Structures are given as C-alpha cells and as structure tokens.
C-alpha cells in the first residue's frame, strides 16, 4: 500500500488513485494506458510569461 509520501509536493489526484486501483484489479493494463497517452500541453500562456520575465 504505496504510502503516499506526505512530503511530496504533488498530492495524488482522484484520477490517479482511480487509475491505480484499476491497474491493481488487472482490468486495465499499463499498455492500454500508454497507448492512450495524450501529450496535450497544459497552461501555455503562463509558460510564455515566465520566459519573458527571464529575458528582461
């Protein structure tokens, strides 16, 4: 029972805990999840502002 290291800055999301449960029950395979991986960029506008601040 992978005891969530309380000190990890990133708390596990409900989605993650659900996915983990599905994988542990053998109903979902990691291969099936990998094939479904969406590389969609998250927060693009915030990233651009960070770069401008550094150059300044």
């Amino acid at each position: 029972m992978m005891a969530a290291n309380p000190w990890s800055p990133v708390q596990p999301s409900a989605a993650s805990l659900l996915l983990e449960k599905c994988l542990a029950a053998g109903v979902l395979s990691q291969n099936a999840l990998d094939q479904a991986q969406l590389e969609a960029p998250c927060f693009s506008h915030a990233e651009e502002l960070q770069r401008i601040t550094e150059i300044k």
Binding site: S13, A14, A15, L17, L18, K21, C22, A25, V27, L28, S29, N31, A32, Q35, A36, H45, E48, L49, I52
Partner: protein
C-alpha cells in the same frame, strides 16, 4: 498556414498508419511533414482510399458494400462512410466535408486519430495465439468485450475516488495568496493582456 503542431500530429498519425502496414501507403515514403499533412488532411482520391481502408478494418462488412460501387459514384461512397462513422459516434451523418477532407486540420487529425485508436485497440491478454482459424464466429468476441467492460465498470463504480474524478477540484495555494487570487477584475485583465505574443 498549417501551424507546426498540426504538422507534428499529422506525422504521428502517418507513423501509426505505417505501423499498421496500410496497403495504401505501399510505395509512398514521405519524409516532409507538409506532404504527410496534404496526404491525410486535403481532399484526394488517396485520402478516401485510406479512410476506406480504416473503416474496412474497423467494420469488415462495409468493404463488400463499397467495392460494388463504380468510380463514377464517389458521392455515394462518401455518404456510406459518413453513415458508419455516425454509427461509431465520431461525426454527424451530414458531415460530408470531414470525409472529403475540407474540415479544419485539427478536426481532421482528431478524426483520423480516433479511427486509428479503434484499430490499435490493445486486444487484452490471451492473444498470444498466431494463425489459426479466420472462422471464429463474431459471437465469441462480443461476449469477451462485454465481460471485460463489465469488470471495468464494476471497478470504476466501486471505487471511493470515482465521484471525485467526475468533478475534479484542486487548490494548491496557501492562505497568504488568497487575497491575490480573489483580487478585482482589473488585475485579471492586466495579467491576461500581458501574455499576448508581441512582447
């Protein structure tokens, strides 16, 4: 001007198609992302051959229905494909522009991407089994899928985290940042306007 992202997505799709040994790509080696894009997202007789192939792979009985149609009846072919795709929940039954390749590049990429998802659907566990018999009856595959789906749904709904995934909430900010985050509509406008590209 097909932005750098659409060209990359088209390339990915093109790679997936190559992996699936699509006969329509035999003797066609495109290294230029624009050529790959023009092949997959611009109206051409080749594109239609690819889509026909994708659809024959997903639903094989459609192949007999399409092969009986003469080359002069291209409009009827497009309507039959649109009807299948509607039955698969991918597009509206009158979305003929998507099938012809006149729809927005993203929409096309997403559309072809979804078709490919279905074909590459990891057939679970048992399948080491090689060559044998073509003949297996449509009835055994349906029973298996139902069973598997039932197990997934049972697991999904038995989980305490299931409700939280339907309405995800996340607040990572401490108390001292609350005043900044609740701040007046005017600061929000200043922060959003500063991100526009010319800077």
């Amino acid at each position: 001007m097909t932005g750098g992202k659409e060209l990359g997505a088209a390339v990915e799709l093109y790679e997936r198609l190559q992996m699936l040994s699509c006969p329509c790509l035999e003797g066609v080696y495109l290294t230029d992302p624009q050529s790959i894009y023009e092949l997959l997202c611009t109206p051409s007789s080749h594109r239609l051959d690819i889509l026909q192939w994708l659809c024959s792979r997903i639903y094989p009985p459609v192949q007999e229905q399409l092969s009986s149609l003469k080359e002069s009846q291209t409009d009827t072919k497009v309507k039959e494909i649109a009807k299948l795709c509607f039955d698969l929940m991918l597009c509206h039954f009158d979305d003929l522009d998507l099938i012809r390749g006149h729809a927005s590049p993203f929409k096309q990429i997403s559309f072809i991407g979804q078709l490919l998802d279905v074909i590459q659907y990891p057939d679970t566990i048992s399948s080491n089994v090689i060559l044998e018999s073509l003949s297996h009856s449509t009835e055994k595959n349906v029973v298996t899928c139902i069973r598997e789906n039932e197990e997934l749904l049972k697991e999904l709904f038995s989980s305490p985290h299931f409700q939280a995934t339907l309405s995800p909430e996340c607040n990572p900010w401490p108390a001292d940042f609350k005043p900044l985050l609740n701040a007046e509509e005017s600061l929000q406008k200043r922060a959003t306007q500063s991100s526009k590209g010319k800077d």
